[PDB]
Amino acid sequence: PSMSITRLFPALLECFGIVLCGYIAGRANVITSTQAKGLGNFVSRFALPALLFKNMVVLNFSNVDWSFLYSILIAKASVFFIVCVLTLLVASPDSRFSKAGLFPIFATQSNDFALGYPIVEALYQTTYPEYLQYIYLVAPISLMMLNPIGFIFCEIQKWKDTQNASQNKIKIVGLGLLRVLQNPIVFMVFIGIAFNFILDRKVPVYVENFLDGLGNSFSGSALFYLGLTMVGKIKRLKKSAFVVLILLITAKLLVLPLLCREMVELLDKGDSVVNHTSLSNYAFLYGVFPVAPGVAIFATQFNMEVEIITSGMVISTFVSAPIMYVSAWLLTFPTMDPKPLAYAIQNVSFDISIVSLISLIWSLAILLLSKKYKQLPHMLTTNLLIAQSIVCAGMMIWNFVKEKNFVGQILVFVLLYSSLYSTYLWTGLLAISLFLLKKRERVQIPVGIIIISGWGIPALLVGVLLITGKHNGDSIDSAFFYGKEQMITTAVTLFCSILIAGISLQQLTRHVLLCLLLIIGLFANLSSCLWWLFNQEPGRLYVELQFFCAVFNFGQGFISFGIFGL
Numbered sequence: 001p002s003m004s005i006t007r008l009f010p011a012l013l014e015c016f017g018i019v020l021c022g023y024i025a026g027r028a029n030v031i032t033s034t035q036a037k038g039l040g041n042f043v044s045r046f047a048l049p050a051l052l053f054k055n056m057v058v059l060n061f062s063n064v065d066w067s068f069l070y071s072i073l074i075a076k077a078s079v080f081f082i083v084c085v086l087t088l089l090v091a092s093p094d095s096r097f098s099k100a101g102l103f104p105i106f107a108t109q110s111n112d113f114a115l116g117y118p119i120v121e122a123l124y125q126t127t128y129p130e131y132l133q134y135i136y137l138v139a140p141i142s143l144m145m146l147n148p149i150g151f152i153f154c155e156i157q158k159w160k161d162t163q164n165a166s167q168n169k170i171k172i173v174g175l176g177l178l179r180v181l182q183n184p185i186v187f188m189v190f191i192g193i194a195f196n197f198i199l200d201r202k203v204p205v206y207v208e209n210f211l212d213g214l215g216n217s218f219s220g221s222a223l224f225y226l227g228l229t230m231v232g233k234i235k236r237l238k239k240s241a242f243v244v245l246i247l248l249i250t251a252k253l254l255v256l257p258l259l260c261r262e263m264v265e266l267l268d269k270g271d272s273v274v275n276h277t278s279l280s281n282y283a284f285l286y287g288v289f290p291v292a293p294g295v296a297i298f299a300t301q302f303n304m305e306v307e308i309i310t311s312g313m314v315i316s317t318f319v320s321a322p323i324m325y326v327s328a329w330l331l332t333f334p335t336m337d338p339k340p341l342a343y344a345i346q347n348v349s350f351d352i353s354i355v356s357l358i359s360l361i362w363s364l365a366i367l368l369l370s371k372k373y374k375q376l377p378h379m380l381t382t383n384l385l386i387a388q389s390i391v392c393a394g395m396m397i398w399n400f401v402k403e404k405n406f407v408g409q410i411l412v413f414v415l416l417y418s419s420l421y422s423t424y425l426w427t428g429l430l431a432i433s434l435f436l437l438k439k440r441e442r443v444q445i446p447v448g449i450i451i452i453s454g455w456g457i458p459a460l461l462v463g464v465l466l467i468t469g470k471h472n473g474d475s476i477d478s479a480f481f482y483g484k485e486q487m488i489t490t491a492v493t494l495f496c497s498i499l500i501a502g503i504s505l506q507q508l509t510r511h512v513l514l515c516l517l518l519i520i521g522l523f524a525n526l527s528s529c530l531w532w533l534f535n536q537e538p539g540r541l542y543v544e545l546q547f548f549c550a551v552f553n554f555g556q557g558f559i560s561f562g563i564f565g566l
């Protein structure tokens with residue numbers, strides 16, 4: 001029904017493929033600054049102002065509800081106040097104000113022009129078109145209110161750095177207001193409002209085509225420039241920097257969306273509860289948008305804490321996408337029939353599987369071209385990577401052959417679950433290898449025996465499950481292919497693997513990092529299995545468990561890519 005979600009994934013792929021192409025183009029010393037600077041000038045001075053002006057001429061203020069605006073603005077203000085007061089309380093008075101001048105802006109100003117707008121357009125085109133007009137009401141008005149406080153704090157920092165007592169508060173406030181008014185967004189929004197008042201909701205044809213041509217390329221050009229502006233800005237930092245960065249990113253992506261949603265339910269008191277639900281979903285989706293590079297521009301202008309802000313913007317840009325996907329899907333689950341839940345879990349499984357598959361072949365190609373697998377413990381890691389690649393490929397093939405052929409279906413199921421159980425064991429097997437390496441014992445490692453074990457017990461388990469189990473082909477999900485017996489064998493496999501990892505627990509640090517991260521997902525799957533078997537009656541909690549289990553099962557390659565990929 002409402003909230004057509006199938007269009008979200010292609011939009012995310014488009015929006016990140018453009019950024020990736022821009023990044024790699026600059027990376028390979030192909031594009032130089034000259035045209036890149038020209039591209040940035042075109043985006044900032046011509047394309048974005050044209051888009052704002054054309055979308056601001058046609059607004060139809062007479063039927064625009066302001067409850068959403070109040071909710072979003074006050075929630076942003078609440079996060080702003082919380083972060084600002086915490087920064088004032090915590091930061092050392094040496095340069096505390098500087099922090100308070102930029103840090104709370106990081107959690108409030110988003111990239112809702114270049115990134116968020118395509119996403120909401122894909123999500124809300126044929127369902128709620130009017131939501132699209134809210135972005136241009138939310139992004140500038142916030143810049144009206146919250147950011148001038150940041151500028152005046154930065155100016156206080158600059159003044160105390162200069163130690164010039166002659167300057168009064170009037171000068172500082174004036175400089176801050178001059179800085180905030182100088183931005184193109186402010187005065188172009190004002191000009192748009194003035195022209196909307198003047199022309200009585202009419203667009204000149206002589207310039208309408210010019211405005212459309214200038215504004216249509218803005219999204220892509222801005223995405224390409226953003227990709228170009230991330231080539232060499234991420235650098236190693238200290239532990240305190242890492243901690244404060246994690247807190248900032250969690251404030252942006254975890255606190256603000258929840259406050260926005262809750263205040264949306266609080267303020268709004270209209271009927272037709274479906275529209276209230278849609279507004280809440282839209283507010284939460286708007287909360288999770290990334291951080292715009294405008295804050296990085298401000299920091300560079302002020303020449304203070306530039307590297308922290310830049311690195312945070314870069315990292316949050318990438319972190320936004322998976323959170324966006326999982327958030328959209330999990331909010332969409334409650335208003336769905338169980339069979340659509342099965343189809344949805346198949347869709348998310350296929351999507352994560354293809355992306356993780358690309359990551360996995362990239363990592364495997366790097367590893368094989370390294371020729372570093374011939375010594376311990378890299379060959380076992382290669383085996384695990386191959387098992388993950390095969391499970392992803394089997395997931396895609398199973399998605400295609402869910403109701404295509406019979407013998408093909410059983411062979412695909414056998415291959416997929418043999419690879420799945422192979423990864424389940426190979427976690428604990430790597431744990432054993434690491435533990436025996438910890439012993440520092442000059443004893444030969446049965447490499448042939450250990451590999452044949454790791455690749456032979458899972459196949460034997462699947463085979464005995466097939467022999468003893470009963471075929472049940474009416475279940476969409478692959479877990480319920482055979483029934484209780486498959487759940488029992490998966491549960492005992494998980495329990496054995498977790499026991500092995502717990503008893504057990506040269507780049508050993510990365511290996512132990514992987515041999516710690518995989519096991520949280522191991523407990524997740526085990527808990528889901530025992531939840532299903534013990535709780536025969538369905539409670540209102542296993543849906544998120546199923547979604548998380550599917551995510552881990554088919555995207556576990558991302559952990560290996562992150563650790564053993566650079």
Ligand SMILES: CC(C)CCC[C@@H](C)[C@H]1CC[C@H]2[C@@H]3CC=C4C[C@@H](O)CC[C@]4(C)[C@H]3CC[C@]12C
Pocket residue numbers: 013354358
């Ligand atoms: C970095 C590069 C190599 C990534 C390439 C990703 C490609 C192969 C991915 C990204 C989006 C994907 C598509 C997303 C959705 C669908 C609809 C589905 O019903 C059939 C598969 C199909 C049509 C996918 C085919 C593969 C696809 C085009």
Ligand SMILES: CC(C)CCC[C@@H](C)[C@H]1CC[C@H]2[C@@H]3CC=C4C[C@@H](O)CC[C@]4(C)[C@H]3CC[C@]12C
Pocket residue numbers: 242245246249315319322323326
């Ligand atoms: C539903 C899930 C998958 C959504 C995403 C959650 C996870 C993957 C996200 C949420 C916050 C993220 C962290 C935020 C900040 C940092 C600090 C940076 O210096 C390294 C990455 C790191 C440590 C991120 C790793 C990935 C992370 C833990």
Ligand SMILES: CC(C)CCC[C@@H](C)[C@H]1CC[C@H]2[C@@H]3CC=C4C[C@@H](O)CC[C@]4(C)[C@H]3CC[C@]12C
Pocket residue numbers: 234315318319322326352551555558562
């Ligand atoms: C499919 C969903 C659920 C998960 C997607 C995988 C996520 C969690 C992974 C895939 C690649 C990962 C990134 C790989 C490399 C880096 C650079 C590092 O300096 C900081 C962390 C960061 C930025 C990682 C953050 C987490 C990350 C984005």
Ligand SMILES: CC(C)CCC[C@@H](C)[C@H]1CC[C@H]2[C@@H]3CC=C4C[C@@H](O)CC[C@]4(C)[C@H]3CC[C@]12C
Pocket residue numbers: 012013016017020318321322325351355
């Ligand atoms: C997860 C689904 C739903 C959305 C798609 C997200 C994709 C496009 C994202 C998730 C994590 C991202 C990666 C995170 C970190 C890095 C390292 C950096 O040096 C190059 C880009 C690269 C390799 C990113 C490429 C794009 C990426 C793979």
Ligand SMILES: CC(C)CCC[C@@H](C)[C@H]1CC[C@H]2[C@@H]3CC=C4C[C@@H](O)CC[C@]4(C)[C@H]3CC[C@]12C
Pocket residue numbers: 253254323326327330331334
């Ligand atoms: C019917 C109503 C009440 C359902 C409400 C579901 C809420 C509580 C769920 C749905 C989506 C969820 C989010 C999905 C993904 C992430 C990213 C993770 O790194 C931190 C938690 C966070 C941010 C979740 C917080 C809780 C969340 C907002």
Ligand SMILES: CC(C)CCC[C@@H](C)[C@H]1CC[C@H]2[C@@H]3CC=C4C[C@@H](O)CC[C@]4(C)[C@H]3CC[C@]12C
Pocket residue numbers: 024027355356358359362
């Ligand atoms: C499809 C999804 C998973 C995105 C995949 C992105 C990852 C796997 C790949 C795609 C293109 C890759 C980049 C291609 C070229 C280079 C230049 C080289 O000198 C360093 C590595 C670097 C910078 C690669 C990093 C990893 C990379 C970003």
Ligand SMILES: CC(C)CCC[C@@H](C)[C@H]1CC[C@H]2[C@@H]3CC=C4C[C@@H](O)CC[C@]4(C)[C@H]3CC[C@]12C
Pocket residue numbers: 517551552555556558559561562563
């Ligand atoms: C499906 C979802 C839940 C997968 C989430 C994967 C997360 C936990 C993974 C993916 C990429 C990983 C990062 C990759 C690289 C590094 C650099 C290393 O020096 C410290 C760990 C760190 C920072 C990893 C932390 C964990 C990490 C963020």
